[PDB]
Amino acid sequence: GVPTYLLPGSGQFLTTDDHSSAPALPCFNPTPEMHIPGQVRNMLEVVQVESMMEINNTESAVGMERLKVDISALTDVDQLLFNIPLDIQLDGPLRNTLVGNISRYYTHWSGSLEMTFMFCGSFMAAGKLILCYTPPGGSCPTTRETAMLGTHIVWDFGLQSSVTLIIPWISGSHYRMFNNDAKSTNANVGYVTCFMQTNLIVPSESSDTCSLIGFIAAKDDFSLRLMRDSPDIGQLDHLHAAEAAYQ
Amino acid sequence: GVPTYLLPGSGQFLTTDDHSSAPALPCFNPTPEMHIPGQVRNMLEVVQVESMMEINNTESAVGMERLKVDISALTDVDQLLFNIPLDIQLDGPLRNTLVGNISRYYTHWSGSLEMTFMFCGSFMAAGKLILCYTPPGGSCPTTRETAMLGTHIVWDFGLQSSVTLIIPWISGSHYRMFNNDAKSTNANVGYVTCFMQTNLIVPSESSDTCSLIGFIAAKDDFSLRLMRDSPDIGQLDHLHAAEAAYQ
Amino acid sequence: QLKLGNSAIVTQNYCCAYGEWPNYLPDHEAVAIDKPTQPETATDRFYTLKSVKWETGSTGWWWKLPDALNNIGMFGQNVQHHYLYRSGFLIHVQCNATKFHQGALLVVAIPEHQRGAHNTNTSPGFDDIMKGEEGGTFNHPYVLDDGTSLACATIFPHQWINLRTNNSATIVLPWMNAAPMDFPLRHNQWTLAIIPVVPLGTRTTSSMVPITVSIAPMCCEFNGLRHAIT
Amino acid sequence: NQHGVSETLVENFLSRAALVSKRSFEYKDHTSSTARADKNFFKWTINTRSFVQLRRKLELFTYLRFDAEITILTTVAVNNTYVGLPDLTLQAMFVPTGALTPEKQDSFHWQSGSNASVFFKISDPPARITIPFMCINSAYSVFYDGFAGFEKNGLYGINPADTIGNLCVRIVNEHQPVGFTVTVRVYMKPKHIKAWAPRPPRTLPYMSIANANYKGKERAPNALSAIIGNRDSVKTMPHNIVN
Amino acid sequence: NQHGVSETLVENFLSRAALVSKRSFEYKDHTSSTARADKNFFKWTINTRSFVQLRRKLELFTYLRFDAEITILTTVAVNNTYVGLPDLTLQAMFVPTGALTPEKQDSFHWQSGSNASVFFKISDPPARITIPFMCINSAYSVFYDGFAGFEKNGLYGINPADTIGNLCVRIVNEHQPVGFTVTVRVYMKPKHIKAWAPRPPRTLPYMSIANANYKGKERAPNALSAIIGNRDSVKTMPHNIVN
């Protein structure tokens, strides 16, 4: 007949192959495809939707107090409000985001991020902030004089109650790494800080402890590759009633 | 289905095969090819670059004294300065060269060699040498009267501080052998000798012990085949921290 | 002349490293979305290092780029303020003596010179590699301090200063990295290596013969502008 | 944009042959074993809910339309002395949801007059069958906000239309004078995936397979009151570059 | 020129399936073995640095762009009496650089929800997978003159972008009443090689895999002060034809 010979890799079961197999149910007519709303053809569509950062990932922030950042009226000039580690692959405020949990299924990642800070004070509350993205190499800038030299945006609380802080894609390589190292030149992203540009100035009837909801999305140039398991979920023993699927 | 039968050589793992295999990462987009300087498409490009001979491969030549050859003023007529065994496959002055270490990955070799002797005396230092390539069969010619009959070149130290001693490809066969035998008719190349054509004549202020740096390259007609392991490097036990790649 | 910026060198033969002349980063190979700033004359100029004494018992000298130039001039100020970095170099190593001196200098520019320490299995630390403007002296230049060979070191981009023949070496380096730009404070893409293959010898009155190294960072790009690290 | 987006495709994201079932069942004289122990066969109601890697990937979406590609890796071990591993022939009969699953190893339900059986061996490559899209609806309800029955005793979140069926796997050989621990690992690769309505990725650990209950870790990360692990203050950088 | 130059091609020079990993790990009841001993699995950080034949061939170049073709040859031996060699099923799960490697043989990381596992046997032909070009840069930095981190504690010469990943290989079977010494030889053939910036071939022997340290042989050849073996004088021919 046809003279063949088995290559190495014969009889192996690669879990990521793309071969057809013998169908168990022949001449089975599947259910006709009905138009269901919101088809995801590509997981970047899940990533490019903005989702809340837990910038207030501290102790004594129980439950829902972790999403918002309580800014207040400050009697001193140019105080730091918050800073955000930008590793979407590692644990931090970006881990429980759509750009974070989907990227932890991957190892390499490119493309720009898109922060959005939604201010949730009163209409009478007026003030200005700065949103300083600092490219890495140095420490986190603790003064506003240090952080203004990086990529920043000055944001009034006029009718503007939201922003678009484009964290630009600044890297030597085309992608990044995970490699358990947040301080590596191949994995570290930089630091977004936020300072009082002026102050949070409220009247006598508005609440002084106003909150910032911080979002993060990804831009159109975002990319992910080298798919891996998620470290977010784990399994020590079998789940409950998993034996009951055998009974 | 398709009636087949397994040939002999089925399930073998030949290390030098050219078969495609099932990729572990499907739809993986690699990093785009950036123009990096100096691509080697062919290992003869590494070979055709001139590299220093260790003609002074003697004892009491410690370290860097082995590259250069200290020639001096001689009171006697027509003395031998140095001679070079020309086996690029075997151990000798040509082993630690680009034409040597890359050829020791191979067994057969064709093509002409290209020696270059760079003189490193003073500008006031004047003299003449001869560079006698002798085809094999006889002994190494010890007198200049014997070595002038072979392929030679007479070289002034005028503005000429370098040469191009084309060792021509003279062989019966198309290629050569290694076969652990430097004296075989299939492996021996011949002998390059160097005699004082006149003398090394320096003034009272130039250093009399002038040096010759000897290079060797390969020509365009050089060739290598029948690839083998390199005998230059070896391994008795595992290297240090090689177990640490498993921990 | 080698006129770069306000700096210039009059000369009376160079070596494009791997045939490539250093240019700016092309847009199809660009990775960062913002425009890289190009200090076209403040940094594209000859920065001259400290001259080292080419003596009789000398083993060698190595300067890692841009680590030799991370604290010099406006190039040192663009490096410390910007995260990314991309430039080629025009190294002009120049060493002249009389017509009675002899010697040879393998002025060789090594791409990615991962060094090694003798007799120990511990990797070289940060202080053994990032020497800065002072550079370093070769411990074993016969094996280039990495187990390789100096005899084959001419496969690298380098020429010669034979005091018989010439008195200068010009090596013109492109950007040599797998990445288009790189963080310059933790990586050294090139390494200018200067090795006494034939030592300095003469019978005349022994003058000091130094080797002066002028390095001109050509086609400097920079991204990631922020506060200085220094 | 030179960077390819082709690995984030859901056709590449979900089509990984992940583990969906694993039973190490004994293989011996089952004349003294109890009713709980597997008497040389096991039923398995085919679900993606048992192993949390494929579950959380499929719980990213509300509705899924995939063809399962069931690959059955059967491996064997010996329960003092050791002898050679046998070349056991196995039958993996596909039983629909709620149909008659067999009571014995040698019962007359394994004759498979219409049920799709696959007969494979341990020494062979693993048996791979393509289960097609077998839902009465146009997509698998991964999350079914509702109840199965018309009475008020139905199970919440469990649509039986979402269930593929039963993968009844037995060993075709008779019992042998020594016992073997035959482990059957089932690997399902969803293919031709059409995924609708993406969802938040589940942060808290799973409690059961029948429902979306949650307890969380006792402390952060992935705790109930604190999903992301805690730091000192909001102005304190965890992985700061301090030189 | 009639002589072909096609064997000195780097596509032919480097594409040899050379040995890159080898562990003879035990296979038995690991209820009394220590933490250092392999409890039926091993992790391996994939590198070309461990075996000096492929290492010196890839250390001829500064930058390399190849697709690895990992071929895993698993062979088995028995630790008094002798019995037949088992047909052990092995899993070789590909873990990225710095991801979660499994702690046990039967841990729930081997389910491979997204990690590329290959399931092969000893009796089968060796499992061959093509690892693509997996660097964030456009080429593998074989020599990385620099440091990994932004702090001054990083390892010199080790770029983690150069690292392929982890090749976590376990035995899918349970423990058996006799012990086996299961040796797993991994053979990597780089293919589609694009090689940049050639380097001097390393003369001195290697000391470690993490760095380019050197000691040399005590005497010539390949010594520190003398790479080429010594002769009598510069005018003395070693292999002279004396008739």
DSSP result, C104-128: EEEEEEEES-----BS--SPP-HHH
Q: Are C104 and C162 in contact (CB under 8 A)?
A: yes
Which chain A residue has the Cα nearest residue D216?
A233
Amino acid present at B222: F
- The minimum CA-CA distance between B56 and chain E, rounded to whole Å, is 6
Amino acid present at C19: G
Compute the distance between CA of residue B34 and CA of residue B31 in angstroms, rounded to an integer.
Answer: 9
Among the partner-chain residues E197, E200, E213, the one whose CB lies closest to the CB of C149 is: E200
Compute the distance between CA of residue A30 and CA of residue C58 in angstroms, rounded to an integer.
Answer: 82
In this structure, how many other beta carbons lie within 10 angstroms of the beta carbon of residue E32? 7
Pick the CATH number of E1-243 from 3.40.50.2300, 3.40.50.300, 3.40.720.10, 2.60.120.20: 2.60.120.20
Please report how many Cα atoms fall inside a 13 Å half-sphere around the Cα of residue B108, on the Cβ side. Answer: 12
Q: Are D3 and A221 in contact (CB under 8 A)?
A: yes
Alpha-carbon dihedral of residues E110, E116, E119, E122, nearest 10 degrees?
-100
Per the document, the length of chain D is 243
Among the partner-chain residues D57, D77, D78, the one whose CB lies closest to the CB of E113 is: D57
Among the partner-chain residues B50, B118, B241, the one whose CB lies closest to the CB of C162 is: B118
Q: Find the domain containing C17 and state its range.
A: 1-230
In this structure, how many other beta carbons lie within 10 angstroms of the beta carbon of residue B160? 11
Question: Which residue shows structure tokens 């394994």?
Answer: D110
Compute the distance between CA of residue B85 and CA of residue C228 in angstroms, rounded to an integer.
Answer: 59
Return all residues near A105 (Cβ < 8 A) that are at least 6 apart.
Answer: A224, A227, A228, A229, A230, D13, D57, E114
The method of structure determination was cryo-EM
Q: Are B37 and E197 in contact (CB under 8 A)?
A: yes
Q: Are A106 and A227 in contact (CB under 8 A)?
A: yes
Q: Are B79 and B195 in contact (CB under 8 A)?
A: yes
Compute the distance between CA of residue E56 and CA of residue C149 in angstroms, rounded to an integer.
Answer: 13
Question: Which residue shows structure tokens 């945006």?
Answer: A153
Helix (H) or strand (E) segment spanning residue A147: helix A144-147
Name residue D42's beta-bridge partners.
D169
Compute the distance between CA of residue D66 and CA of residue D192 in angstroms, rounded to an integer.
Answer: 5
Per the document, the length of chain C is 230
Helix (H) or strand (E) segment spanning residue A39: strand A39-40
Return all residues near A133 (Cβ < 8 A) that are at least 6 apart.
Answer: A150, A151, A152, A165, A167, A168, A190, A191, A192
Alpha-carbon dihedral of residues C129, C132, C133, C134, nearest 10 degrees?
-50
Among the partner-chain residues B13, B17, B31, the one whose CB lies closest to the CB of A175 is: B31
What residue segments make up the domains of chain D, in order of their start? Answer: 1-243
Name residue E8's beta-bridge partners.
none
Alpha-carbon dihedral of residues D112, D117, D122, D128, nearest 10 degrees?
180
In this structure, how many other beta carbons lie within 10 angstroms of the beta carbon of residue E85? 15
Peptide bond into E221 cis (omega under 30): yes
Query: What tokens does C125 get?
Result: 């630390």
Amino acid present at C180: P
Per-residue 3-state assignment (H helix, E strand, C coil) for B107-157? EEEECCEEEEEEECCCCCCEEEEEEEEECCCCCCCCCHHHHCCCECCEEEC
Partner-chain contact C114 E144, CB within 8 Å: yes
What residue segments make up the domains of chain A, in order of their start? Answer: 1-247
User: For testing the chain E interface, which of C123, C126, C142 should be mutated: the one with the most E CBs within 10 Å?
Assistant: C123
Alpha helical stretches, state H, chain B? 44-47, 98-101, 144-147
D neighbours by CB contacts (3+ pairs under 8 Å): A, B, E
Q: Are A89 and A224 in contact (CB under 8 A)?
A: no
Question: Which residue shows structure tokens 């780097």?
Answer: E10
CA-to-CA separations, A190 to A131, A185, B93, C54, D242, in angstroms, rounded: 13, 10, 53, 44, 13
- What counts of helices (H) and strands (E) characterise chain B? 3, 14
A137 — contact with chain C (CB < 8 Å)? yes
Helix, strand, or coil (residue C40): coil
CA-to-CA separations, D35 to D30, D31, D168, in angstroms, rounded: 10, 11, 17
Among the partner-chain residues E118, E148, E149, the one whose CB lies closest to the CB of A13 is: E118
Instruction: Answer positive or negative: Cα dihedral of E38, E42, E46, E51.
Output: positive
Helix, strand, or coil (residue E235): coil
Q: Are C69 and C90 in contact (CB under 8 A)?
A: no
Compute the distance between CA of residue B169 and CA of residue B111 in angstroms, rounded to an integer.
Answer: 5
Amino acid present at C162: N
Query: What tokens does C83 get?
Result: 């995260």
Q: Are D175 and D27 in contact (CB under 8 A)?
A: yes
Helix, strand, or coil (residue C143): helix
The CA-based angle B4-B5-B11, given to 5 degrees, is: 115
Compute the distance between CA of residue C179 and CA of residue E137 in angstroms, rounded to an integer.
Answer: 5
Amino acid present at B127: G
Which chain D residue has the Cα nearest residue A34?
D138
CA-to-CA separations, E200 to B46, B216, C9, C172, in angstroms, rounded: 9, 14, 32, 20
In this structure, how many other beta carbons lie within 10 angstroms of the beta carbon of residue E106? 16
Alpha-carbon dihedral of residues C178, C180, C184, C186, nearest 10 degrees?
-30
Start-to-end CA distance of chain A, whole Å, equals 48
Name residue D93's beta-bridge partners.
D117, D168
Q: Are B217 and B50 in contact (CB under 8 A)?
A: yes
D76 — contact with chain E (CB < 8 Å)? yes
Count of the separate structural domains present in chain C: 1
Resolution in angstroms comes to 3.2
B39 — contact with chain D (CB < 8 Å)? no
Exposed/middle/buried for residue A210 (C-beta within 10 Å: 0-12, 13-18, 19+): buried
Closest to B39 in 3D by CA, of E5, E138, C112, E194: E194
In this structure, how many other beta carbons lie within 10 angstroms of the beta carbon of residue A85? 25
Peptide bond into C66 cis (omega under 30): yes
Partner-chain contact A31 D126, CB within 8 Å: no
Partner-chain contact C188 E146, CB within 8 Å: yes
Question: Which residue shows structure tokens 């075997």?
Answer: B90
User: E strands along chain C, which residues?
Assistant: 14-16, 47-48, 52-53, 61-65, 86-94, 102-111, 161-162, 168-173, 190-201, 210-221
Exposed/middle/buried for residue D85 (C-beta within 10 Å: 0-12, 13-18, 19+): buried
- The minimum CA-CA distance between C77 and chain E, rounded to whole Å, is 19
Compute the distance between CA of residue C125 and CA of residue A104 in angstroms, rounded to an integer.
Answer: 33
Amino acid present at D91: Q
Q: Are E227 and C140 in contact (CB under 8 A)?
A: no
Q: Are A73 and A204 in contact (CB under 8 A)?
A: no
Compute the distance between CA of residue A139 and CA of residue B176 in angstroms, rounded to an integer.
Answer: 62
In this structure, how many other beta carbons lie within 10 angstroms of the beta carbon of residue C182? 24
Query: What tokens does A150 get?
Result: 């990086």
The DSSP-derived string for E37-98 is: S-SSEE--B--S-SSHHHHHHHTTEEEEEEEEEEEEEEEEEE-----PPP--EEEEEEE-TT
Question: Which residue shows structure tokens 């030597």?
Answer: A172
Name residue E23's beta-bridge partners.
E184
B1 — contact with chain A (CB < 8 Å)? no
Q: What is the CATH number of the domain that holds C101?
A: 2.60.120.20
Q: Are E157 and E211 in contact (CB under 8 A)?
A: yes
Q: What fold does the segment set A1-247 form as a domain?
A: Jelly Rolls (2.60.120)
Partner-chain contact D12 B27, CB within 8 Å: yes
Helix, strand, or coil (residue D59): coil
CA-to-CA separations, D190 to A18, D47, D61, D168, in angstroms, rounded: 11, 12, 14, 20
The CA-based angle D108-D111-D112, given to 5 degrees, is: 125
Instruction: Answer positive or negative: Cα dihedral of A175, A176, A179, A184.
Output: positive
Exposed/middle/buried for residue A246 (C-beta within 10 Å: 0-12, 13-18, 19+): middle
Amino acid present at B77: V
Instruction: Answer positive or negative: Cα dihedral of E210, E213, E218, E220.
Output: positive
B neighbours by CB contacts (3+ pairs under 8 Å): A, C, D, E
Query: What tokens does D150 get?
Result: 């018309």
DSSP character for A244? G
| Backbone angle region of B180, left / alpha / beta, with phi > 0 → left and psi within -120 to 50 → alpha | left
